[PDB]
Amino acid sequence: PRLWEGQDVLARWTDGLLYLGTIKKVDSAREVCLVQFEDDSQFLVLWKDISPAALPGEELLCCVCRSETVVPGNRLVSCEKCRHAYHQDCHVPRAPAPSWVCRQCVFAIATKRGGALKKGPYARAMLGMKLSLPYGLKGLDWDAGHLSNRQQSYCYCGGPGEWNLKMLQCRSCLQWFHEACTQCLSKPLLYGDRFYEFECCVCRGGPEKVRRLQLRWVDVAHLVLYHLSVCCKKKYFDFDREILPFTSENWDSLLLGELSDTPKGERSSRLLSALNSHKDRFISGREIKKRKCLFGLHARMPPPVE
Ligand SMILES: [Zn+2]
Ligand SMILES: [Zn+2]
Ligand SMILES: [Zn+2]
Ligand SMILES: [Zn+2]
């Protein structure tokens, strides 16, 4: 076929990044593969997110439309890095007529955790690529909350993703974008943090615009508790040894705006009060015969905005 067992490929993960992997099982019906990575973890990966190595004997055929047919207006261009060939019109945006580097390779170089490269040749090149989407946005089918689509197409990259796991939603097109694919963030994203106003490159026709929304103490409590729940894979967290230290030691990264006006000696009481006041959000360890100062979420769900 196109993919076989034991084949080494590049798989795009839900963080928008590429990882080396080996195909273990091929499902031609659902078009997914069981892929094993370097840390011996195994996950299902859609075929659209699997990049096979270019063949030395697959000379000048479009890796997208598979045709060798060439026409004046639409020539074939070979990527300098991955050696895959594209028709000029089978690449988004249009590949220039002939040191060209294709969209995925541009992303593979520029994308970094905490945000992609912000300045440099590859940073400017990715911005150019990010002016367009490699998929039809209006063709996507969303759930009720506009959190996920059945195509599993997100972001500038077109890769998979979970909205709550380091992604930002554009206020204009309502699409979700990977942290690693953005170039506008100064601090790392927390899990489930929607307290942003974000607008993508496509909607602006240029650089992204991002703004931090003002959090309340109940938001801080909920966000930290949710973020730690996901990170640490557990429900209950000690206030004095886990919750408060995370908040205080990482205070600047949390971008809490006006809350920085609160005297540092008071921060503990404000946060703890929020945890004890909203019994509809937070459950105390007392409810299961443990420490009163143990707290958790009733439902491990992100902090609601407003
Ligand atoms: Zn992405
Ligand atoms: Zn083509
Ligand atoms: Zn390439
Ligand atoms: Zn947008």
Side-chain angles (χ1 to χ4, degrees):
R2 316 251 70 213
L3 303 174
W4 56 92
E5 295 186 1
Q7 179 184 6
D8 296 328
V9 295
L10 288 174
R12 193 185 304 111
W13 188 235
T14 52
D15 56 10
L17 295 177
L18 291 182
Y19 297 83
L20 280 167
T22 302
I23 295 183
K24 293 275 293 183
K25 294 294 176 53
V26 177
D27 196 312
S28 302
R30 306 141 86 206
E31 292 188 334
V32 301
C33 289
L34 186 60
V35 180
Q36 186 170 57
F37 303 93
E38 298 170 74
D39 44 28
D40 286 272
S41 63
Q42 293 187 344
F43 296 106
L44 298 178
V45 180
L46 303 168
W47 281 8
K48 74 173 176 64
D49 296 311
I50 294 180
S51 293
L55 295 179
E58 257 189 352
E59 48 276 335
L60 276 259
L61 72 157
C62 185
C63 63
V64 176
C65 76
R66 299 290 310 283
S67 177
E68 294 190 11
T69 301
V70 71
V71 119
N74 186 21
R75 300 293 181 179
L76 289 100
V77 186
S78 299
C79 178
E80 189 70 23
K81 298 198 177 304
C82 72
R83 305 298 178 177
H84 280 105
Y86 300 79
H87 278 115
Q88 292 176 268
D89 293 331
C90 288
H91 184 270
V92 180
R94 170 177 170 90
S99 62
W100 180 73
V101 174
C102 81
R103 184 186 190 92
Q104 276 198 21
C105 293
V106 164
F107 274 61
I109 297 300
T111 48
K112 296 301 162 207
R113 296 176 181 88
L117 299 175
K118 297 195 169 185
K119 183 55 186 180
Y122 295 102
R124 305 184 214 101
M126 199 186 64
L127 174 54
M129 297 281 179
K130 282 164 54 175
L131 300 178
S132 308
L133 301 177
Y135 58 87
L137 187 52
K138 296 184 179 182
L140 302 182
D141 299 308
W142 293 88
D143 50 23
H146 209 107
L147 303 174
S148 68
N149 62 78
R150 75 181 189 94
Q151 287 82 9
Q152 300 191 236
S153 294
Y154 304 93
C155 193
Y156 311 99
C157 58
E162 297 183 72
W163 63 273
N164 53 313
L165 300 184
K166 289 177 166 295
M167 300 189 76
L168 288 176
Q169 184 179 31
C170 178
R171 66 183 315 186
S172 300
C173 66
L174 302 181
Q175 173 63 288
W176 294 85
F177 295 80
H178 297 116
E179 176 193 62
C181 297
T182 64
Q183 293 172 306
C184 60
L185 295 167
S186 57
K187 303 291 185 180
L189 290 181
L190 294 187
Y191 293 140
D193 196 340
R194 325 246 296 279
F195 299 101
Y196 291 86
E197 225 164 41
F198 174 75
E199 199 178 5
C200 73
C201 291
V202 185
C203 283
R204 282 200 139 244
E208 297 138 347
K209 181 180 185 179
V210 65
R211 181 174 69 92
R212 178 55 151 178
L213 302 182
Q214 181 58 59
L215 276 80
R216 307 164 292 159
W217 285 107
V218 60
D219 300 322
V220 172
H222 199 147
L223 180 55
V224 168
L225 216 44
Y226 176 79
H227 175 79
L228 289 180
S229 292
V230 178
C231 291
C232 300
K233 306 129 187 177
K234 66 179 186 170
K235 182 178 177 181
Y236 288 95
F237 295 84
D238 180 273
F239 179 77
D240 293 286
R241 303 215 158 200
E242 293 182 288
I243 302 181
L244 187 60
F246 178 84
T247 309
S248 70
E249 295 176 345
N250 300 286
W251 185 267
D252 294 335
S253 291
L254 298 188
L255 297 175
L256 299 183
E258 296 171 358
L259 294 186
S260 304
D261 295 336
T262 300
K264 320 208 158 48
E266 294 187 5
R267 292 177 180 176
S268 180
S269 64
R270 323 282 285 115
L271 188 60
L272 181 59
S273 179
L275 289 169
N276 278 319
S277 299
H278 300 76
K279 272 151 268 183
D280 61 324
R281 296 177 183 231
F282 315 119
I283 178 175
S284 171
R286 143 166 49 243
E287 302 304 319
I288 56 167
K289 307 167 62 188
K290 287 177 176 295
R291 275 175 292 153
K292 168 178 77 283
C293 50
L294 280 174
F295 297 96
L297 300 171
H298 276 121
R300 211 197 68 171
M301 229 53 193
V305 289
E306 303 174 341

